[PDB]
Amino acid sequence: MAPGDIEDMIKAGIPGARVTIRDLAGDGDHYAAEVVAEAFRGKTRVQQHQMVYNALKGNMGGILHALALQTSAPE
Numbered sequence: 001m002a003p004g005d006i007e008d009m010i011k012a013g014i015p016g017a018r019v020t021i022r023d024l025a026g027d028g029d030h031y032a033a034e035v036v037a038e039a040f041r042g043k044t045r046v047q048q049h050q051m052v053y054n055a056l057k058g059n060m061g062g063i064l065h066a067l068a069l070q071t072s073a074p075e
């Protein structure tokens with residue numbers, strides 16, 4: 001996945017989301033993502049994270065450990 005592809009996939013799959021991606025260790029391998037989306041309001045963190053995994057569509061190997069997640073509804 002090229003730089004920016006994680007963010008692109010999240011925003012395509014969760015329309016309206018605000019996404020902040022940081023590359024842990026600058027390593028091109030493990031990342032952290034913050035995703036803020038109205039569709040998350042009232043959902044649990046487990047339910048919100050499920051929506052993010054869905055948006056990546058299996059394109060990121062090892063996503064369970066390789067994409068550390070923070071999610072919320074807009075403030």
Ligand SMILES: [Cu+2]
Binds near residue numbers: 065
């Ligand atoms: Cu790994």
Ligand SMILES: [Li+]
Binds near residue numbers: 022023025028030
């Ligand atoms: Li990284």
